[PDB]
Every structure is written in C-alpha cells, then in structure tokens.
Ligand binder design. Structure first.
Ligand SMILES: *[C@@H]1O[C@H](CO)[C@@H](O)[C@H](O)[C@H]1NC(C)=O
Ligand SMILES: *[C@@H]1O[C@H](CO)[C@@H](O)[C@H](O)[C@H]1NC(C)=O
Ligand SMILES: *[C@@H]1O[C@H](CO)[C@@H](O)[C@H](O)[C@H]1NC(C)=O
Lengths: 264, 129, 108
C-alpha cells in the first residue's frame, strides 16, 4: 500500500550535450536547440534531511536538467506523465545493480512513492519491492530493458519532442556545482509519443524490522539531495577540438559580449 | 476484495480432495495466503501458507507430505490438495489473506504473521464412508 | 497457547480474556485476536497488539505483558456472545498457533 512519509545555486556552464550524431573535428558549430541557459538559478532539493521527507512533484516545461553528487544509490529512477493516475499513460524508469527497466504503462501512483529494499535475516541476499510506487498497472504498452546508467557527479538531460523521448547522461569525478565543461553524451532515444507535463524523482528506502512497514517508523534512509533546472530555446556556439570532443560553448544571449562573439 | 471458494465436497476415506480459492487480479498478485481448517465443535487449525508471486511455500509440521499447496496465474486461483483421508477429517476449510508484508515473510520476519482480514465463505469437506 | 475455555458477565460491564504462551511465540511475536459468530467465518478484532480494523468499535482493547496477553471488552452488549481466538506465530514450530476458544455467555 501507500505510506504517508511527509535553496538556489548557480548553474555556471553545465548542461551541454551533443546535438547530433555527426563527427566534427576542430570546428565551430552554431545550433539552435533547447539548452539550459548559462549562469541560471538551479533549485536544490533536500529530499531527506539528516528524518525529514520532502519529495515534490515538479513541472516538466520544455525539458529537464538533473544533477546529483550522490554515492549511496538512494536515487533509483524517475516518473513522467500528466495526471500520474489510471486515466492517462505514464513513463517509469528504474535502475538497479544489473539492469535498467523503462516502462510506458497506465500506472496508479501513490502520493509518496519509493522503492523498498528488504534484507534477509542472514546477510547473503536482498530483494526490492516496487509495491509502494504504484497500486495498479494496466493497458501496458511499452517496455525496455538494458544495462544500468546509475566525489562523483551525475548529470542527466531529458527532452520529449517529435514523438521521441531523449535522454543524455554524463558521469564526472569532482571534489555547489563545479566550473568547467563536460559535454553530455547521447544515452537513449525512445519512440514513445505521449503527454509529459510533470515528473517526480524515485528514491530507495530500507526496512526497519522493529515496527510495521505501513508507517514512517518502519523505513530508514540516509540524506539525499539533487539539483533541478529547466531548458529554454537558445542558439549556442559549440567548439569541436581535433579529437571530436566539445570543449567549449557560447550562449548567444547571455550578455552583449556573447552576442558579439556569436555574431562574428 | 472477495475470496470465492469451491462448493462443499463429500469424499470417501483414502481418496484425495482438491479445494480452490479464486481471487481478483491485483489481490492475487500482491498478497500471501493461508489455509485454515476448523473441525465441527473444535478450535481453528493452521494448514499452510502460499505466496503465488514468489513461488515460496511453507508447510505445517503435521501436514508435511500430505498437503500440497499450489497456484495458477490464469483466472487467479489458489489450490489446496489433501490426500490419505482419515475418518475424522470432516471440517470447514478457509482461504485467508494476510494483511502483513509478504516481503517481510520472505526475509524471515514473521512478527506480524497472524492477521487475516479477508476470508472466504468456507468449503465444507465431509470425509465419510 | 493456553486460555480459559469459558467466561461470563452481566451486560454493561468490562470483561477480560487471558492468553498465556511460551517465550518463543508470544514473547517474540505480536498477538492477534479474532471473533467468530456461530454462523459465520471468524473476524479480525485486534492486530499489531493494539490496532483495530475499520468497523470495529472502541470497546475492544488488547494488551500484553511479558509472555501473556489479554483482551478487554467494555460495555458488554447482548450481541457479543461468540468465540474469541488468540493467535500468534511460533518460531520453534514455525507456524501459526491459535490459543483455543473462549465463550462469553452474557446473561441478561
Ligand atoms: C535488477 O533488475 C533486473 C531487471 O528487471 C532484474 O532481472 C533483477 O532481478 C533485478 N535485481 C534485483 C536484486 O532486484
Ligand atoms: C484499459 O483497460 C480497461 C480494463 O482494464 C479497458 O476497459 C479499456 O478499454 C482499456 N483502455 C483502452 C484505451 O482501451
Ligand atoms: C497534453 O496534456 C495537456 C495538459 O493535460 C492537455 O491540455 C493537452 O491537450 C494534451 N496534448 C494533446 C496533444 O492532446
């Protein structure tokens, strides 16, 4: 069943991805697309505090930039849709130690969905429930199974256009978002073709076997936090070095200097 | 939530009896079930547990090698089979749903096994000659 | 589990039923109580040692001390004559165990 569980930073120059699958070397390429603007305000969410819970449902707008410097595999996937109930179709992405599962299905999501992890009395094996994420799943259309893609910052870009759902990802070692450039590589393109208006992050909680699991006293987890930003239609100038890797970019609307750079 | 059983059965000693309990779609696929027998004028007795979506079956000490519990995903039915009938095996058999966590049962924590909120109408088995 | 075979009392009073067990079943696992009218299937009254399912009034209260448990009914009503079962899980036997039947004969 469902269990009742319940700041801003600078984005600098993060959120650049490869616009197409064409190899280019040592060239300046201008492209109009949906990008996260430079030096924008990115919202920082503390999903779990110290235990205090706050995992809200956020709008999708024209695309989403997601970031997390987490190493405790608390964050496991995402939910996308419009009403997030049985009246419409929704998309669900779940990761674990061996695979990633993507499903377009008509789910009936709980108010506070999470993935429960159960450990055996002898510590040799465990299990994952997914019974607290949704109550029903019918009229199920799309399925996809692959290898998982989840001091270590992870960045994702989500777009939904032309009947395709596009995901780009990047993993980088760091030591609140850093400076510098790291272009996001294309991860997946799914021919899904649905409405997406809202989305919510999926977390994983462990079991405390001293109290029943239908209350907040039966689940425990560590602190988790993430960063969220939104994409807007902009013209960008990307630089491809000799190895075919994007190493710098210019936003043609940030300030008059950048506009002058793009004009030339 | 409803649990529908089969009809009352009359059997001869030494034969075998099969009792069915039919459930809905979600309830069958998200629950663990127990089988409880009650003799006429006596107290309740436990016969076994079955989790159809994990393929794990527990058994009673007095019903090992004599009671077979199985399931079948189509039409969502859970079956119990009794063999080597005795003259005093006439009773009423109930299929009941656990309100606890089947994953808690799988992990080995049975501190909340014993709650049965939903029950079937009951199948009367008369074993006589 | 062990419990007395019969009980009685006058309407409007507070009656109690005991259930004594060992340390491997009652002292380690939560206790549950059931009500069974003579013409129907048993019904759950108390679970998780204190809770009541929706539709059950507030007159039924469960308690536990050490390796024994008790069920108390306040404001006894003329339609409360039935069998009450004390049920738990035994780790040694590894199975459900019921404490037997207790009958309340309400005179008046
Ligand atoms: C990980 O996910 C894959 C894909 O569904 C599944 O086969 C596997 O059993 C999962 N492992 C665990 C421990 O849940
Ligand atoms: C969804 O499934 C229901 C029954 O589960 C069915 O009646 C309905 O037709 C399905 N949706 C569509 C669009 O056909
Ligand atoms: C998608 O959803 C929005 C908001 O629910 C709705 O107004 C719109 O009509 C839908 N889009 C299409 C193409 O039907």
């Amino acid at each position: 069943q469902c269990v009742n569980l319940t700041a801003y930073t600078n984005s600098f120059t993060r959120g650049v991805y490869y616009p197409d699958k064409v190899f280019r070397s040592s060239v300046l390429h201008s492209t109009q697309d949906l990008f996260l603007p430079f030096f924008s305000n990115v919202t920082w969410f503390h999903a779990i505090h110290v235990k205090r819970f706050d995992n809200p449902v956020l709008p999708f707008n024209d695309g989403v930039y997601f970031a997390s410097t987490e190493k405790s595999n608390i964050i496991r996937g995402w939910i996308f849709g419009t009403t997030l109930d049985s009246k419409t179709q929704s998309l669900l992405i779940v990761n674990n130690a061996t695979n990633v599962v993507i499903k377009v299905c008509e789910f009936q999501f709980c108010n506070d969905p999470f993935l429960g992890v159960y450990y055996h009395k002898n510590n040799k094996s465990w299990m994952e429930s997914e019974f607290r994420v949704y109550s029903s799943a019918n009229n199920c259309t799309f399925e996809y199974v692959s290898q998982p893609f989840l001091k270590n910052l992870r960045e994702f870009v989500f777009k939904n256009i032309d009947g395709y759902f596009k995901i780009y990802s990047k993993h980088t070692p760091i030591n609140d978002l850093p400076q510098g450039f790291s272009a996001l590589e294309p991860l997946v393109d799914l021919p899904i073709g649905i409405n997406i208006t809202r989305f919510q992050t999926l977390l994983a909680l462990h079991r405390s076997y001293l109290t029943p699991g239908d209350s907040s006293s039966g689940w425990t987890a560590g602190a988790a936090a993430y960063y969220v930003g939104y994409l807007q239609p902009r013209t960008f100038l990307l630089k491809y070095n000799e190895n075919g890797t994007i190493t710098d970019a210019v936003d043609c609307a940030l300030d008059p200097l950048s506009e002058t750079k793009c004009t030339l | 939530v409803q649990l529908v059983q089969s009809g009352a059965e009359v059997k001869k000693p030494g034969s075998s009896v099969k009792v069915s309990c039919k459930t809905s779609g979600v309830i069958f696929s998200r629950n663990a079930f127990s089988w409880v027998r009650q003799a006429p004028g006596q107290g309740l007795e436990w016969m076994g547990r079955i989790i159809p979506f994990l393929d794990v079956t527990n058994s009673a000490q007095e019903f090992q090698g004599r009671v077979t519990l199985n399931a079948d995903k189509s039409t969502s039915t859970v079956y119990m089979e009794l063999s080597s009938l005795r003259s005093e095996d006439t009773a009423i058999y109930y299929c009941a749903r656990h309100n606890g966590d089947p994953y808690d049962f799988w992990s080995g924590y049975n501190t909340w096994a014993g709650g049965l909120d939903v029950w079937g109408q009951g199948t009367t088995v008369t074993v006589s000659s | 589990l062990t419990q007395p075979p019969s009980a009685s009392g006058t309407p409007g009073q507070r009656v109690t039923i005991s259930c004594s067990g060992s340390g491997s079943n009652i002292g380690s696992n939560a206790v549950n109580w059931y009500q069974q009218l003579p013409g129907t299937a048993p019904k759950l009254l108390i679970y998780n040692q204190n809770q009541r399912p929706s539709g059950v009034p507030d007159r039924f209260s469960g308690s536990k001390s050490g390796t024994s448990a008790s069920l108390a009914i306040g404001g006894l009503q003329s339609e409360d004559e039935a069998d009450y079962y004390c049920a738990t899980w035994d780790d040694n036997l590894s199975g459900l165990v019921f404490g037997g039947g207790t009958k309340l004969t309400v005179l008046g």
